[PDB]
Design a protein around this ligand. Structure first.
Ligand SMILES: CCCCCCCCCCCCCCCCCC(=O)OC[C@H](COP(=O)([O-])OCC(O)COP(=O)([O-])OC[C@@H](COC(=O)CCCCCCCCCCCCCCCCC)OC(=O)CCCCCCCCCCCCCCCCC)OC(=O)CCCCCCCCCCCCCCCCC
Ligand SMILES: CCCCCCCCCCCCCCCCCC(=O)OC[C@H](COP(=O)([O-])OCC(O)COP(=O)([O-])OC[C@@H](COC(=O)CCCCCCCCCCCCCCCCC)OC(=O)CCCCCCCCCCCCCCCCC)OC(=O)CCCCCCCCCCCCCCCCC
Ligand SMILES: CCCCCCCCCCCCCCCCCC(=O)OC[C@H](COP(=O)([O-])OCC(O)COP(=O)([O-])OC[C@@H](COC(=O)CCCCCCCCCCCCCCCCC)OC(=O)CCCCCCCCCCCCCCCCC)OC(=O)CCCCCCCCCCCCCCCCC
Ligand SMILES: CCCCCCCCCCCCCCCCCC(=O)OC[C@H](COP(=O)([O-])OCC(O)COP(=O)([O-])OC[C@@H](COC(=O)CCCCCCCCCCCCCCCCC)OC(=O)CCCCCCCCCCCCCCCCC)OC(=O)CCCCCCCCCCCCCCCCC
Ligand SMILES: CCCCCCCCCCCCCCCCCC(=O)OC[C@H](COP(=O)([O-])OCC[N+](C)(C)C)OC(=O)CCCCCCCCCCCCCCCCC
Ligand SMILES: CCCCCCCCCCCCCCCCCC(=O)OC[C@H](COP(=O)([O-])OCC[N+](C)(C)C)OC(=O)CCCCCCCCCCCCCCCCC
Ligand SMILES: CCCCCCCCCCCCCCCCCC(=O)OC[C@H](COP(=O)([O-])OCC[N+](C)(C)C)OC(=O)CCCCCCCCCCCCCCCCC
Ligand SMILES: COC1=C(OC)C(=O)C(C/C=C(/C)CC/C=C(\C)CC/C=C(\C)CC/C=C(\C)CC/C=C(\C)CC/C=C(\C)CC/C=C(/C)CCC=C(C)C)=C(C)C1=O
Ligand SMILES: [Cu+2]
Lengths: 126, 104, 122, 115, 89, 61, 50, 110, 99, 57, 173, 63, 153, 49
């Protein structure tokens, strides 16, 4: 019965997937990013898979407005999250004891700070 | 350069044996080839082998400055892969190895 | 001549004071290092009081500023003293930073001079 | 070619100016400087410079001869490819001006062979 | 909405001369998106009476990993068998 | 048309199909000969020495 | 602005340069991908323990 | 053909000819000039000799790299064991190139 | 042993202002579609102040780097018991000069 | 004598100044060397070099 | 439990765990003249493994930093359009993830062999870490005591006649 | 299956499912088009499969 | 460690026996294996044989991993491309080229493939490296670099 | 305060660099000097503007 599990493919792996009804059964009463993107995806899929020109063009018109609204929502999200990240970074480095006890050997060049070759550098003349 | 053949392939099995004995970057292969050339026509004779050994002694002495008794007092005459002809003892050992490898 | 790494302990105030006093008044140190430490001290002493005076002036102005003046005394004094606190802490911090940086440079010079670093040689 | 080579000459000349004025010791052997680096950087542009000077001269003849001969030029594609090969192979022969400077025999032989 | 250039240019009623009467030019009627050919090779050959268009479609573009793995199983088994033969050799 | 190829077929196809194989195979055999000569020196020397008789080798020595 | 961080690139990619050719027979080992797949497991265990 | 129809700019960059046929008489709406440098400056085209010379130079440069550049980084610090052997190993491949070694066998030429 | 490794814990804090500026610029670009000039002057002024701060930091670092090459020291003449200012050139690793 | 042959007089003087400084400091390379812990392993680094070496006639 | 437990670069769940930063710090306070050839070979193998491991660490951290940067940017995935912001913000997020990964210690057979060896090399390395790297040695000794390793250098030694040189963290007796 | 159905009614059993559903609902993402052609261009691109059914593509000889 | 007894120099008969042994080894050397005549030739050939055995085992494990991980990971992983996170079925989301995907499920299938194939290969190679043993050609102390001469074998 | 007072005191009233001036550099420690740089006085228009 190995073929029944290897060579037999699930119906969902071949047939086109349907619409997840539970995603739309109950929705919040807020015209928020989730609802806006759900509507955008619905209209986009309908445009992709539909032969009706009259409904697609109006769907395109509505989808442009949906894109603008989603851009506004994303701008708000970006502002809030970026400000929070910057403030958290600043507070972390304000309250974090930065290690100031690293090795300083690199900054020292004993042979260069005090020229080891002395006067022999200038010409030689021996 | 100082061997008897314009290339190592013209030399018989002795050159291949020298190449196997020494590493590819070890220049003692040339001394082993010199030992092969010295032993050509002498290894198959009890006196010829000793004559070839004396030829190796002379070759080492002419290649490097040496004192009387060093080659006689060499402790180990065996040779390893990473032995280089930087001393008369090493040159003599490589030449002896080539003489031993030489068949005809 | 001290532990290095993130897990180590940063310089303490007592340790810094002891090290700077050692550099100032020790015999094994060199005249150039001693002069460096003295110059650090003299050239850093200024900021501590400069910042305090600037903060005092700015706080005197901010006490009579347009909104602080009309605010009640409880809010007025607290708001008007903020510039003074900021300037005072800035002056003290910059004084300490300059003095400690130059003293640490002098300590490095001393360590190199006496060969007390395991990875430094001519 | 000029676009490819100009930054190298600019960097070399800037390093020369820094050595002269600030004494950066880029070309001072005492503390890591490489006097031969200056020659390398200069000639890397210098040979393409002379190639740039010469290459345009061929076009004058290549245009004039057909015009006066009332005939198409001979193997225009091959001439174009030859000038291109010269242009983009002159970047590996800058050391023929530095044979005797003391560079390694490997680089010397490569430069001579490409030249 | 046209797929073929000849059908697109045969009878055009939205030309600038016709549209100038109403003086309305919608953005949805751009020549850039007006026509677009299919992605499959199509070439003309001489027929019995006129040129005829033949389409050269070689392979599909919607195969899935399950089918690919089923087709690849024999190659994997052959690799394993050859490796085992080498080991036993 | 779909068959328009960006290749200059004037004598190039014939060259690549007739002249290229000959000298390319000659070069391949020459390179293989060099590789074998350089890397299998011991085997070649042993085969050469075993091809001939002991007496002739003694005469050559 | 990251111009002066080239020492880290050098520290990473100089140890790759110093590796000799495999068939020169100096160490006869190549553990790049092996070390990659082993360090995946090692980091998993380390994070879980931490 | 799919590349030409969908992404004409990439087709032109790669050097593909217009794959559509205009036998019907109406020219295509995305035709472009042919950029044939890749297919012309090749060993199989008019740039055959230039590409042969460039290939020879590239092989020579690759050999030079393999002998002189990569080995230079193998050893950069003092070595405790067999330092001289390990240095000579890398020096041999560079100092023994046939370029400046071969020729004595045919010295009679000069 | 001269590896010249700088601490990332120190590098990130220095790098913060530039990423802050670029993020604010992107936000301004995105919001320009539905905002007015007067409202966005806040973001413009914030970007300007951050740019001024970064300019001051860059200038301070550049001034330190350029002043390195002037080696000024105090030398104590014991016979006169006087400190004198002396100027001299610098010798260091060429990597420092290149950077 | 090998170093003298390989070095010109000026470079030899530079190295002699370095040698004088190092001797005055009393510095040995062994007490400063720690790069072996970072150098890659090799067959020559085996803990038994005498056994690693093979001798034959 | 992979099929390469023999491999020196490999490790086990309960093997001694050492961070990359700790390893590099320990490399600083060691001298090769004072180590046996076997110890030198062990250190060379450890460096051979670390050469690849350190370079791979950012590769491991990349997906986490990429996801964090996407979340910071928002709930919109715009592909090439958002690369500028994604990689400008990720240029600081990824260093944080690499910091966490490097601070995270990982077990290794070479680490346990080098630290817990009962020979002169093991004693030397332990004493050097104890003296010149007290901060690292404190954590290392806590880990060893928790993993039931007993050495005279450990601060948690209950049979020692000399007082410890570092604070002893709480632990179960 | 019977055991799962029997335990379905329990609120404690449904708490984990509710948490999973909430996490899934907090996972939405948007995929905008970042090309100038935009939505109309995408629509025209997708319209390939239905052009043959339009009136303008019906055979109608002028003569 | 201790040193063994050094034999006296070989006689002519011993030299001839060594020459014969070297000739036999050279003859036994395979024709298709290109190894240069050097002190490390035999060690290199042994290392190559061990590497070939490891290669065989690794490729067998890789093929087995490709066979196994497919139905277990990649195919179930492709079920995540059935619908978007919003619940709508998969639809094409062009980047810069508005490719025509009229073919049934062309967009979904190609999008799933672009992630499944790299995942398939990565999982297969991880399986191979996990279940393949390198013990045969692993030398922690690098003691297998000792030179072996043809006559010794 | 930020743009004129603090920079003035940190630049002219002290020759000692701040930590952030050189913590990322690998030069040895050294002091500043306003009278041994930019002889052309090209920084005056820059600061003024
Ligand atoms: C993208 C869409 C999806 C489809 C594609 C898939 C994804 C893209 C990548 C695919 C291509 C990868 C490259 C080719 C590999 C296969 C080649 C082949 O079949 O020829 C036989 C060839 C030799 O095989 P073998 O001798 O039998 O060895 C197997 C034995 O078991 C012995 O095992 P071993 O552990 O000892 O390893 C052996 C190997 C080990 O060698 C090494 O040690 C090399 C690696 C060292 C470590 C990495 C260093 C570089 C990266 C540093 C990163 C630094 C980051 C920055 C850090 C700081 C800043 C943050 O050494 C050798 O045997 C000698 C040859 C070494 C050649 C290495 C170079 C290969 C690439 C170049 C030639 C091919 C063209 C590639 C074109 C470009 C592809 C992208 O295969 C190998 O290269 C070795 C096996 C590799 C693993 C299996 C790969 C299966 C293929 C699918 C892999 C899918 C990706 C996941 C793995 C990652 C890539 C490996
Ligand atoms: C390593 C250095 C790294 C530096 C990194 C710097 C990073 C910062 C970069 C900033 C700058 C970016 C912009 C660069 C612009 C450069 C100038 C330019 O052309 O711009 C045009 C650009 C636009 O002007 P345009 O006239 O429209 O440009 C037309 C194109 O450039 C088209 O020009 P074209 O019409 O002249 O086209 C010529 C091309 C056209 O011909 C072709 O199509 C090439 C041939 C293809 C077919 C070959 C087939 C061969 C047969 C098959 C293989 C046989 C071998 C065996 C295998 C097969 C067996 C069957 O053919 C060639 O000349 C190429 C040589 C072909 C030989 C192939 C040999 C292969 C052997 C393999 C080893 C050797 C490989 C060498 C490289 C090969 C080429 C990639 O200029 C501007 O926009 C204004 C100027 C802007 C300047 C900006 C600043 C530049 C700074 C550069 C600094 C460089 C520093 C280092 C220099 C020294 C390096 C050694
Ligand atoms: C009168 C007025 C009244 C007003 C009233 C007003 C009232 C207001 C009320 C309040 C209203 C506001 C309420 C606000 C609520 C806010 C909160 C909220 O709702 O949630 C927001 C928010 C919802 O999400 P979102 O931000 O909206 O974004 C959703 C997007 O859809 C997300 O999109 P995405 O899927 O693209 O996400 C990217 C994602 C992923 O991105 C990626 O990186 C993936 C894709 C990368 C692609 C490019 C690279 C690919 C390279 C190849 C990768 C191959 C795989 C293998 C690689 C190996 C290494 C090479 O990135 C990450 O996850 C990054 C962090 C990863 C952390 C480490 C892994 C965590 C999971 C571990 C699972 C372990 C399972 C063990 C099972 C054991 C079973 C025995 O909540 C969160 O997401 C919170 C997450 C916080 C971080 C959690 C970190 C957990 C770390 C766990 C570590 C465990 C270690 C030990 C494991 C031991 C195992 C044995
Ligand atoms: C003689 C040499 C120069 C000496 C200058 C001395 C200092 C003077 C400072 C004056 C500042 C402006 C004051 C304006 C007040 C009035 C405003 C007004 O009514 O609005 C109208 C209008 C501005 O209208 P607005 O509505 O206020 O504009 C608002 C805009 O947002 C604002 O936009 P905008 O108007 O600025 O637009 C012009 C735009 C175009 O840009 C410019 O205008 C360029 C400005 C360059 C200034 C360079 C100054 C150099 C000298 C410094 C000081 C020298 C020593 C002074 C004495 C010692 C100290 C006391 O400016 C920019 O965007 C520049 C960007 C920032 C660059 C800052 C400077 C460069 C920094 C980086 C490089 C620094 C290092 C050097 C690198 C190069 C090395 C080769 O102003 C004018 O048209 C000019 C003034 C009125 C007309 C002239 C009336 C008098 C007749 C001319 C007498 C002088 C010439 C003839 C002499 C012979 C007579 C017989
Ligand atoms: C399809 C035909 C194929 C024919 C087979 C040959 C071509 C194979 C593909 C190209 C690579 C050729 C590399 C040859 C050399 C490899 C070894 C090596 O570099 O060392 C030996 C030599 C180096 O020898 P060496 O001096 O290092 O000697 C080593 C030994 N000791 C140390 C003892 C001295 O290589 C060179 O000299 C390279 C010089 C650079 C130019 C080489 C050009 C070769 C001839 C032209 C070939 C063109 C082929 C075109 C094919 C396609 C078109 C038809
Ligand atoms: C106190 C309450 C009453 C109301 C207060 C009103 C706020 C006044 C804010 C003044 C801002 C001045 C900006 C100066 C820009 C130039 C800085 C420069 O060149 O650096 C010199 C000096 C720095 O010189 P430095 O060389 O010593 O740098 C020190 C470097 N570190 C930090 C690493 C030690 O600047 C500073 O000291 C701080 C500069 C901060 C710049 C921040 C810019 C963006 C934000 C501006 C503030 C916005 C506040 C809005 C109101 C909020 C009210 C709650
Ligand atoms: C130019 C921009 C557009 C083109 C981009 C490409 C340009 C690339 C140019 C460089 C190429 C590479 C060569 C590098 C040469 C470097 C030379 C060099 O270092 O010279 C520097 C020179 C110094 O050279 P120097 O020769 O005097 O150096 C002294 C060294 N010794 C003693 C050894 C000779 O400095 C200047 O040119 C002056 C710069 C002044 C900058 C002033 C900035 C003021 C900022 C104010 C705002 C901040 C807050 C405070 C505001 C206060 C308001 C009251
Ligand atoms: C130390 O540990 C180890 C390692 O180091 C970490 C190793 O590397 C290895 C190496 C070997 C390996 C094989 C690597 C192991 C790697 C692992 C396990 C991680 C990788 C795992 C994966 C890639 C699998 C990921 C896939 C999934 C989780 C499946 C996801 C499936 C989903 C979401 C199903 C979604 C489907 C649906 C909801 C159905 C929708 C159906 C419809 C009809 C649509 C709706 C329609 C209507 C109408 C309602 C080993 C063995 C190891 O043990
Ligand atoms: Cu020239």
């Amino acid at each position: 019965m190995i073929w029944k599990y290897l060579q037999r493919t699930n119906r969902g792996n071949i047939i086109q997937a349907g619409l997840q009804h539970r995603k739309f059964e109950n929705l919040p009463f807020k015209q928020n990013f989730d609802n806006l993107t759900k509507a955008y995806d619905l209209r986009m899929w309908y445009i992709s898979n539909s032969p009706h020109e009259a409904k697609n063009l109006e769907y395109v018109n509505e989808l442009e407005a949906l894109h603008n609204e989603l851009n506004y929502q994303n701008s708000r999200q970006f502002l809030f999250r970026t400000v929070s990240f910057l403030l958290g970074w600043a507070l972390f480095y304000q309250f974090y004891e930065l290690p100031k006890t690293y090795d300083w050997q690199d900054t020292q060049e004993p042979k260069h700070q005090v020229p080891a070759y002395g006067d022999l550098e200038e010409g030689g003349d021996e | 350069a100082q061997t008897a053949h314009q290339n190592r392939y013209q030399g018989g099995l002795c050159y291949a044996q020298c190449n196997e004995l020494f590493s590819f970057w070890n220049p003692s292969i040339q001394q082993c080839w010199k030992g092969c050339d010295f032993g050509v026509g002498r290894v198959n004779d009890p006196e010829g082998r000793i004559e070839a050994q004396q030829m190796c002694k002379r070759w080492a002495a002419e290649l490097y400055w040496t004192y009387k008794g060093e080659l006689d007092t060499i402790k180990d005459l065996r040779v390893h892969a990473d032995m280089y002809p930087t001393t008369p003892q090493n040159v003599y050992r490589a030449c002896l190895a080539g003489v031993r490898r030489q068949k005809f | 001549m001290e532990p290095f790494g993130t897990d180590e302990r940063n310089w303490t105030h007592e340790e810094k004071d002891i090290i700077t006093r050692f550099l100032k008044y020790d015999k094994h140190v060199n005249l150039k290092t001693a002069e460096m430490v003295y110059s650090a001290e003299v050239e850093s002493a200024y900021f501590g009081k400069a910042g305090a005076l600037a903060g005092g002036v700015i706080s005197a102005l901010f006490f009579n500023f347009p909104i602080v003046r009309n605010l009640p005394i409880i809010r007025r004094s607290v708001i008007g003293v903020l510039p003074f606190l900021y300037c005072y802490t800035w002056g003290k911090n910059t004084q300490e930073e300059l003095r400690w940086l130059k003293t640490f440079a002098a300590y490095q010079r001393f360590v190199v001079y006496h060969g007390q670093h395991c990875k430094l040689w001519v | 070619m000029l676009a490819t080579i100009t930054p190298v000459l600019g960097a070399a000349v800037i390093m020369m100016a820094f050595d002269r004025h600030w004494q950066t010791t880029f070309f001072e052997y005492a503390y890591g400087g490489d006097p031969i680096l200056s020659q390398h950087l200069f000639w890397f542009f210098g040979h393409p410079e002379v190639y740039v000077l010469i290459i345009p001269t061929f076009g004058f003849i290549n245009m004039i001869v057909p015009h006066n001969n009332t005939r198409r030029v001979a193997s225009k594609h091959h001439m174009i490819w030859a000038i291109y090969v010269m242009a983009y192979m002159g970047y590996l022969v800058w050391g023929h001006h530095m044979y005797l400077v003391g560079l390694d025999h490997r680089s010397r032989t490569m430069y001579s062979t490409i030249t | 909405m046209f797929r073929w250039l000849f059908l697109y240019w045969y009878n055009s009623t939205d030309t600038p001369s016709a549209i100038a009467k109403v003086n309305l030019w919608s953005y949805i009627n751009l020549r850039l998106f007006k026509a677009r050919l299919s992605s499959s090779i199509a070439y003309y050959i001489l027929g019995l009476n006129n040129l005829e268009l033949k389409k050269l479609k070689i392979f599909y573009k919607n195969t899935y990993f399950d089918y690919i793995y089923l087709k690849s199983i024999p190659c994997l088994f052959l690799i394993i068998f050859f490796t085992n033969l080498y080991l036993f050799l | 048309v779909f068959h328009y190829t960006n290749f200059v077929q004037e004598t190039n196809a014939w060259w690549l199909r007739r002249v290229r194989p000959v000298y390319c195979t000659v070069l391949a055999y020459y390179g293989w000969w060099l590789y074998d000569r350089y890397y299998l020196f011991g085997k070649n020397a042993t085969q050469d020495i075993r091809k001939d008789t002991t007496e002739v080798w003694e005469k050559r020595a | 602005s990251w111009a002066y961080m080239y020492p880290w690139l050098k520290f990473i990619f100089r140890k790759y340069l110093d590796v000799p050719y495999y068939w020169f027979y100096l160490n006869g080992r190549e553990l790049g991908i092996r070390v990659f797949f082993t360090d995946l497991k090692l980091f998993f265990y380390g994070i879980t323990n931490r | 053909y799919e590349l030409f129809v969908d992404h004409p700019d990439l087709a032109q960059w790669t050097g593909t000819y217009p794959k559509v046929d205009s036998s019907h008489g109406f020219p295509f709406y995305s035709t472009y000039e042919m950029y044939r440098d890749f297919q012309e400056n090749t060993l199989n085209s008019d740039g055959s000799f230039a590409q042969w010379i460039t290939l020879v130079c590239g092989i020579y440069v690759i050999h030079v790299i393999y002998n002189y550049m990569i080995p230079y980084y193998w050893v950069s610090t003092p070595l405790k064991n067999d330092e001289f052997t390990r240095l000579r190993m890398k020096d041999y491949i560079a100092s023994t190139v046939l370029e400046e070694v071969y020729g004595i066998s045919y010295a009679e030429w000069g | 042993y001269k590896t010249h490794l700088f601490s990332w814990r120190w590098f990130l804090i220095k790098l913060l202002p530039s990423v802050s500026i670029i993020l604010l610029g992107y936000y301004l670009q995105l919001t320009l579609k539905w905002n007015l000039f007067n409202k966005q002057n806040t973001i413009v002024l914030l970007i300007t102040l951050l740019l001024l701060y970064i300019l001051w930091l860059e200038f301070y670092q550049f001034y330190h780097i350029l002043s390195f090459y002037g080696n000024i020291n105090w030398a104590f003449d014991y016979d006169e018991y006087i400190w004198t200012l002396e100027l001299d050139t610098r010798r260091t690793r060429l990597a420092n000069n290149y950077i | 004598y090998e170093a003298q042959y390989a070095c010109q007089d000026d470079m030899f003087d530079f190295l002699m100044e370095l040698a004088y400084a190092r001797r005055a400091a009393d510095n040995f390379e062994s007490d400063f060397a720690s790069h072996e812990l970072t150098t890659l392993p090799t067959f020559y680094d085996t803990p038994k070099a005498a056994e690693r070496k093979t001798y034959t006639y | 439990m992979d099929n390469n437990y023999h491999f020196w670069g490999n490790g086990d769940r309960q093997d001694v765990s050492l961070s990359y930063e700790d390893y590099y710090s320990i490399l600083d306070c060691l001298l090769d003249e004072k180590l046996s050839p076997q110890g030198l070979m062990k250190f060379k193998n450890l460096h051979e493994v670390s050469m690849y491991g350190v370079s791979y660490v950012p590769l491991y951290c990349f997906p986490v930093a990429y996801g964090i940067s996407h979340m910071l940017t928002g709930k919109v995935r715009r592909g090439h359009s958002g690369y500028r912001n994604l990689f400008s913000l990720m240029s600081v997020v990824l260093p944080f993830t690499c910091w966490y990964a490097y601070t995270t210690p990982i077990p290794r057979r070479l680490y346990t062999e080098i630290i817990c060896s009962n020979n002169a090399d093991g004693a030397y390395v332990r004493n050097r870490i104890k003296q010149q790297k007290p901060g690292i040695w404190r954590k290392l000794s806590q880990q060893l005591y928790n993993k039931n390793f007993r050495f005279p250098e450990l601060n948690q030694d209950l049979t020692a006649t000399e007082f410890p040189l570092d604070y002893v963290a709480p632990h179960k007796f | 299956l019977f055991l799962i159905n029997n335990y379905k009614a329990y609120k404690i059993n449904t708490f984990f499912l509710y948490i999973y559903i909430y996490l899934n609902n907090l996972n939405i993402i948007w995929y905008p088009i970042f090309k100038a052609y935009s939505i109309f261009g995408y629509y025209k691109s997708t319209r390939l499969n239905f052009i043959d059914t339009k009136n303008e593509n019906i055979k109608r000889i002028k003569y | 460690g201790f040193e063994t007894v050094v034999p006296a120099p070989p006689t002519r008969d011993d030299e001839l026996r060594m020459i014969k042994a070297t000739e036999e080894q050279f003859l036994q050397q395979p024709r298709y294996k290109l190894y240069m005549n050097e002190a490390h030739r035999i060690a290199k050939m042994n290392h190559g044989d061990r590497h070939n055995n490891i290669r065989a085992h690794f490729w067998s494990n890789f093929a087995l991993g490709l066979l196994i991980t497919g139905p277990i990971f990649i195919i179930p992983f492709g079920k995540a491309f059935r619908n978007l996170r919003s619940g709508v079925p998969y639809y094409f989301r062009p980047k810069y080229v508005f490719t025509q995907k009229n073919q049934y499920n062309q967009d979904r299938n190609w999008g799933a493939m672009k992630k499944q194939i790299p995942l398939w290969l990565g999982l297969s190679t991880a399986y191979a490296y996990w279940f393949t043993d390198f013990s045969i050609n692993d030398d922690e102390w690098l003691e297998k670099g000792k030179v072996i001469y043809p006559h010794q074998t | 305060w930020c743009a004129y007072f603090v920079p003035y005191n940190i630049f002219f009233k002290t020759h000692m660099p701040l930590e952030h001036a050189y913590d990322n550099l690998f030069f040895p420690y050294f002091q500043h000097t306003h009278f041994l740089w930019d002889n052309n006085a090209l920084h005056i228009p820059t600061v003024g503007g």
